[PDB]
Design a protein around this ligand. Structure first.
Ligand SMILES: CN1CCN(S(=O)(=O)c2ccc(-c3cnc(N)c(C(=O)Nc4cccnc4)n3)cc2)CC1
Ligand SMILES: CN1CCN(S(=O)(=O)c2ccc(-c3cnc(N)c(C(=O)Nc4cccnc4)n3)cc2)CC1
Lengths: 350, 350
């Protein structure tokens, strides 16, 4: 087809530009950010995604700087980057050449919902564990994704590999530095975000990941609503009314404003009867009002819900082996090095 | 048919309870709030809506107190109210017996977009004018609806009467008193709300009203997005980048956080070519970054876009007369009494 040849800089490593030739340029996404294309590397025959955003003349691209720092099996890799012409004349465009992962947790969960089915629990375990590994990794650099939602979780249906994507909202969170509260998509926003907190931490991603878990288990979003108000009612219905101190922890200025008094609903009454107790236990520990009381991504990987993945004889339903699960680095283990005793099972050590 | 007899207090006037009998109970809606039923009054045959919410007696219902004050032709009337049960031998429900209006702006606008059509501008004029009258009225009492959206705008398809509903988020806004920023539904939220302002005014309803106008004209929401971030990009694309003073006016603490540089897009380039210049002019004056620069509901009623409604020969497409449009009260006119010279046309009710 129509072959495009560009001189791109590799994402990581030495700044040694390379001629990158690609064909079959189709559009796979549009949004506020710009456009995401799919293309085939002429060379390898390999599929890649090209995220084309507009170059802000004032400052360096925040997403590019973040992408460049990262190398994880559960995060979409920045292969190359280059500058181009774009849609608007006399305007500069940044092109991020990324890994292409064919499906999204959103499309997959939606097939199941439409077919009146739930995603088999083994997939919920595989997908969730991989999400927490990606979060453990980025969090270790002080980076918060800030937009964890099923649409941002890519899947390879054959390998059962999950890859986090969209670093457009990602930011390095520094204690004492304030941050915008209007980030994060509806249904997945932590209560602190709803209350307009600007002092929130990376625990917002853990809340969001818990909302993904509960949705994969329920077959629909756990906390829906078209306003913060409706979302808060759904949270209160499940978690009970937040205490004076719980509210103080999220946003302090919001301690006076009153909410309806609903009793702490049992999580066992939330999900269907054949739901594993460990799935429920995980939810309750991820979906906490107090941001400091939520599990960390690395502590969630070590949870009993993921024990099946740590079994030596664990196999995918298609007969294939499970993907990489125990190749933890010192960087990803940094928040709690002693967790490796659980994380890396005896079989992975041999 | 089950006949239910209750002892209910009339919405307005003397607190003199009476026996109200109704039949043909049917659920018309479910939400965070509770349930909305449709029923028929035995003695009149009149269809009514019953909004049933759980009431904790450790406070008086805010919506009920607001409803009881209100009496406007473009607002759903509280006919009666009463207490009953539904779920538990302690659980007490407040029941609000309201006017039943058969359709919604949401459902009407959706027929047209599925049909690849726009709502004829006469209906846009009739529906919008009536919405602004309802807003002029409530605002005169210091009450802000706080949830203006097509689903909360009811229509009678035969009379072309619009009635505002859902006072569940409504609040009397007192200057200096802070308010929650998590009110108002996605697409319709004023930028100040997105920025987490707690010092916002009734001008949030005017922003929301403008979003409804632009949607009725476009055939789709003007500022979509699943996050505040995406919504803000859509606003910036249309209104241009907000100046530091414009940002200061909305929420002051967010003056430091930077946005992409988009040039002020012409409002004429936003809508289809056969859009009336007065419709676009109205939008530009409703959809202002500066809350104090937005038209007031009463000033919007007097805009050139609504002139056709003030014509003595205007008639509905079905051959019927236009509904009540000029029965303004001193209460309704209080924000600007001289506006009545435009508002009440020469031919109006003698
Ligand atoms: C060709 N088809 C298009 C329809 N889909 S989809 O909507 O399920 C889908 C959409 C995007 C991707 C994808 C693949 N690789 C990527 N690397 C990215 C990506 O980085 N996306 C992204 C999106 C928003 C902001 N930033 C980045 N997306 C995969 C499937 C199936 C495939
Ligand atoms: C059988 N159909 C049900 C589907 N619709 S609808 O969705 O278009 C519709 C929904 C609600 C009403 C309605 C009528 N009168 C009311 N008075 C209320 C009302 O007060 N609603 C409300 C909603 C949320 C919170 N508080 C109040 N709603 C009318 C049509 C048409 C008729």
């Amino acid at each position: 087809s129509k072959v495009t040849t560009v001189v791109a800089t590799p994402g990581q490593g030495p700044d040694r530009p390379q001629e990158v030739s690609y064909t079959d340029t189709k559009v796979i996404g549009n949004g506020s950010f710009g456009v995401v294309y799919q293309a085939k590397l002429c060379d390898s025959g390999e599929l890649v995604a090209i995220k084309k955003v507009l170059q802000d003349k004032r400052f360096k691209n925040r997403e590019l700087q973040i992408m460049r720092k990262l190398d994880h099996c559960n995060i979409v890799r920045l292969r190359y980057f280059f500058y181009s012409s774009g849609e608007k004349k006399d305007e500069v465009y940044l092109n991020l050449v990324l890994d292409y992962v064919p499906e999204t947790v959103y499309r997959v969960a939606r097939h199941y919902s439409r077919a009146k089915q739930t995603l088999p629990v083994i997939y919920v375990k595989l997908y969730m564990y991989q999400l927490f590994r990606s979060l453990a990794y980025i969090h270790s650099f002080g980076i918060c994704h800030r937009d964890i939602k099923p649409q941002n979780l890519l899947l390879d249906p054959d390998t059962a590999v999950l890859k986090l994507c969209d670093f457009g909202s990602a930011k390095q969170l520094v204690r004492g530095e304030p941050n915008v509260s209007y980030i994060c998509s509806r249904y997945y926003r932590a209560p602190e975000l709803i209350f307009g907190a600007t002092d929130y931490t990376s625990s917002i991603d853990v809340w969001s990941a818990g909302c993904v878990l509960a949705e994969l288990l329920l077959g629909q979003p756990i906390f829906p609503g078209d306003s913060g108000v409706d979302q808060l009612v759904e949270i209160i219905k499940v978690l009970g009314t937040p205490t004076r101190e719980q509210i103080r922890e999220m946003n302090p200025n919001y301690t006076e404003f009153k909410f309806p008094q609903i009793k702490a609903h049992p999580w066992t009454k939330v999900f269907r009867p054949r739901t594993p107790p460990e799935a429920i236990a995980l939810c309750s520990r991820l979906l906490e009002y107090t941001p400091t009381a939520r599990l960390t991504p690395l502590e969630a990987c070590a949870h009993s819900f993921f024990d099946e993945l740590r079994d030596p004889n664990v196999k995918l339903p298609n007969g294939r082996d499970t993907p990489a699960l125990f190749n933890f680095t010192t960087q990803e283990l940094s928040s709690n090095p002693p967790l490796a005793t659980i994380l890396i099972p005896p079989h992975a050590r041999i």
